[PDB]
Design goal:
710 residues, alpha+beta, Rossmann fold, Methylamine Dehydrogenase, Chain H, alpha/beta-hydrolase, eight-stranded mixed β-sheet, amnesia, hydrolase, five-stranded antiparallel β-sheet, prolyl oligopeptidase
């Protein structure tokens, strides 16, 4: 099947580094430079063999046609009110970017407010963050180009959608919050740096600061309100309390769910915002997470995990701040994770829980924390919500593996609350009744029971004849909950496949203890859990090794790449998207320094010893047995992925091709596709999304020789 030859790639055999006595050769270190002629030539040569392989067979075209037809359905976000107007995002179906609409009332005619599609020919300029002024009359929005994390903040007067001159540059990983006097907005920016800042550079991002922009002025006049010169990795995000009196600064260092919480009583400022604010360091450590919900005078309600791995609600009174004085408003649940909490209609709280990887929604009283109402939902996820303190209604969006979703609305002014369906779209061509979603719990190596969702056609025989697509992430306290994917359903319907999602450790499915169970010294638990998910699917008859594909992105790309090295005999195909492959150098680039909380950092001998055992780049090895080769592998990345710099995938594919690809027994392809004008994934235009899934499924189809079922 390999009618092509792997590109010749220079090996710098002098690139040797000592890691606590352990010598490590990095012959493809030169691929770390995205701008060199050598790296550019490498990328071109790789794409030259991958593209024809993916497009050779009719399958890619069949899949693309079907995806284009099925993904073409009206897509709405739930409504949200700002000032006296309602807003919502909407995509007629195949627009590259969804469009923001505005209407003066729910029954009123809607009009285009912000259409990102007209900002580029190919839909590569996307909205990335936004914030309306408290009165809803002004609007700030971030724009990212080519998928980069870099943002340019622009402004508009809402009435008439008038463009304002204000433009803020050097913005990345920024919060946006307007002071309630309507004078300006807080945001974050990084200092000037040598080289490019367009998403193609690998430069580490340090010294992020907090600024205040006065509307109607030049960015050069912005006020520096907080900075951490002796702590280059700290990032301070600002938000205003609901009453507009306090600026709450959440300081983060790394990716753990913990933050310092400082506050500034704006009324106490000597003469408005003129410099470094008079910060009161309420919580001055990284021992716990404190997420602002609302306040009533000096009594602040926070969602926290302080000595509560499943999260809970506490009230901290700024006038009697000692921990011994905090009140527990809504105690922690024994197993269910309190995901998020919102305050609406002054004294109501909307609590969203995660029960065995499915969302539940409840209304509670702010004063006592008592449960008032349960908003009924089918098995799935809450992916959208609106309703701030001054609002008197809520909107919430539900989705699942089989349904595109339902948007509900509830008028909270009514004495007898009655939630109603507000918007529900049906996708023609896919009959949800033909499929089934089951949740099972399988034992991992150490006996821990891991949840896994399996989606398949009703009535299939568990004879191991079906191709399967097993997905996982496993890290950063992220819970992988039910979501609607047309691309995956096409695999089920048109490729006769079985979909599976394993809720492995490292995630947040069972709180912080679940997260800790898949990080640092225990990172191997993630890989074991995932390998055991595969073993379960095989032993139970859903699939067989030769018919099994595993997929993951970012931390999930690391997951599947490691599994390929560790158990090549278990998988037929592996698709790793924008994955972290060099675990010894990840911290050196862009925002990679933040991931050390989940992975550790190679500067430590103890951490190095963990990392070296699973780092994909450092564990490529020909299988011992003569009848075992590596699975077919496809790595997907893009040239503007400044979240996980592409060098990770470049170095990994070079290594796979050299160590494994050259072996005579290796007949399964080991390929990479590097896209242009794209990044980590957020904001990717519809056209690119369609091309990507078409590539993924064509690779699977060709490698496993699966017949398309029309």
């Amino acid at each position: 099947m390999l009618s092509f030859q792997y590109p010749d790639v220079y090996r710098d055999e002098t690139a040797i580094q000592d890691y606590h006595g352990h010598k490590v050769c990095d012959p493809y270190a030169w691929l770390e430079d995205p701008d060199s002629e050598q790296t550019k030539a490498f990328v071109e040569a790789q794409n030259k063999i991958t593209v024809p392989f993916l497009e050779q067979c009719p399958i890619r075209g069949l899949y693309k046609e079907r995806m284009t037809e099925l993904y073409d359905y009206p897509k709405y976000s739930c409504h949200f009110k700002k000032g006296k107007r309602y807003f919502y995002f909407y995509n007629t179906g195949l627009q590259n970017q969804r469009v923001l609409y505005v209407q003066d009332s729910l029954e009123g005619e809607a009009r285009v407010f912000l259409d990102p599609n007209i900002l580029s020919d190919d839909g590569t300029v996307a909205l990335r963050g936004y914030a309306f002024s408290e009165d809803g009359e002004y609007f700030a929005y971030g724009l990212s180009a080519s998928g980069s994390d870099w943002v340019t903040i622009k402004f508009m007067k809402v009435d008439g959608a008038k463009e304002l001159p204000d433009v803020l540059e050097r913005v990345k990983f920024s919060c946006m919050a307007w002071t309630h006097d309507g004078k300006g907005m807080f945001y974050n920016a990084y200092p000037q740096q040598d080289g490019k800042s367009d998403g193609t550079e690998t430069s580490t991002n340090l010294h992020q600061k907090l600024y205040y922009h006065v509307l109607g002025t030049d960015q050069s006049e912005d006020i520096l309100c907080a900075e951490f010169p002796d702590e280059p990795k700290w990032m301070g995000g600002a938000e205003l309390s609901d009453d507009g009196r306090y600026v709450l600064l959440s300081i983060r260092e790394g990716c753990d769910p913990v933050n310092r919480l400082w506050y500034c009583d704006l009324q106490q400022e000597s003469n408005g915002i003129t410099g470094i604010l008079k910060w009161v360091k309420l919580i001055d450590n990284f021992e716990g997470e404190y997420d602002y919900v609302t306040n009533e005078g000096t009594v602040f309600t926070f969602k926290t995990n302080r000595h509560s791995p499943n999260y809970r609600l506490i009230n901290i009174d700024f006038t009697d701040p000692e921990e011994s004085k905090w009140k527990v408003l809504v105690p922690e649940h024994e197993k269910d994770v309190l995901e998020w909490v919102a305050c609406v209609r002054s004294n109501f709280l909307v609590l969203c829980y995660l029960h065995d990887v499915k969302n539940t929604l409840q209304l509670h009283d702010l004063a006592t924390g008592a449960l008032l109402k349960i908003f009924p939902l089918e098995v799935g996820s809450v992916v959208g919500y609106s309703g701030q303190k001054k609002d008197t209604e809520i909107f919430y969006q539900f989705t699942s593996f089989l349904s595109p979703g339902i948007i509900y609305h509830c008028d909270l002014t009514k004495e007898e609350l009655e939630p109603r369906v507000f918007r529900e779209v049906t996708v023609k061509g896919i009959d949800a009744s033909d499929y089934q979603t089951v949740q099972i719990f399988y034992p991992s190596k150490d006996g821990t029971k891991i949840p896994m969702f399996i989606v398949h056609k009703k009535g299939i025989k568990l004879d191991g004849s079906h191709p399967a697509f097993l997905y996982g992430y496993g890290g950063f306290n992220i819970s992988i909950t039910p979501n609607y994917s047309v691309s995956r359903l096409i695999f089920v319907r048109h490729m006769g496949g079985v979909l599976a999602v394993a809720n492995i450790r490292g995630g947040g499915e069972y709180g912080e203890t679940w997260h800790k169970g898949g990080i640092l010294a225990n990172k191997q638990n993630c890989f074991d859990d995932f390998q055991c998910a595969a073993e379960y699917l095989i032993k139970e008859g859903y699939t067989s090794p030769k018919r099994l594909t595993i997929n993951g992105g970012s931390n999930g790309g690391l997951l599947v790449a490691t599994c390929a090295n560790q158990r090549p005999d278990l998988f037929g195909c592996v698709i790793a998207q924008v994955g972290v492959m060099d675990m010894l150098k990840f911290h050196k680039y862009t925002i990679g320094h933040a991931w050390t909380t989940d992975y550790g950092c190679s500067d430590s001998k103890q951490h190095f010893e963990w990392l070296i055992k699973y780092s994909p780049l450092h564990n490529v090895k020909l299988p011992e047995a003569d009848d075992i080769q590596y699975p077919s592998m496809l790595l997907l990345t893009a040239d503007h992925d400044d979240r996980v710099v592409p060098l990770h995938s470049l170095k990994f594919i070079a290594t796979l091709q050299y160590i494994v690809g050259r072996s005579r027994k290796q007949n399964n392809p080991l390929l990479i596709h590097v896209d242009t004008k794209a990044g980590h994934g957020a904001g990717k235009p519809t056209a690119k999304v369609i091309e990507e899934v078409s590539d993924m499924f064509a690779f699977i189809a060709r490698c496993l020789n699966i017949d398309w079922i029309p």
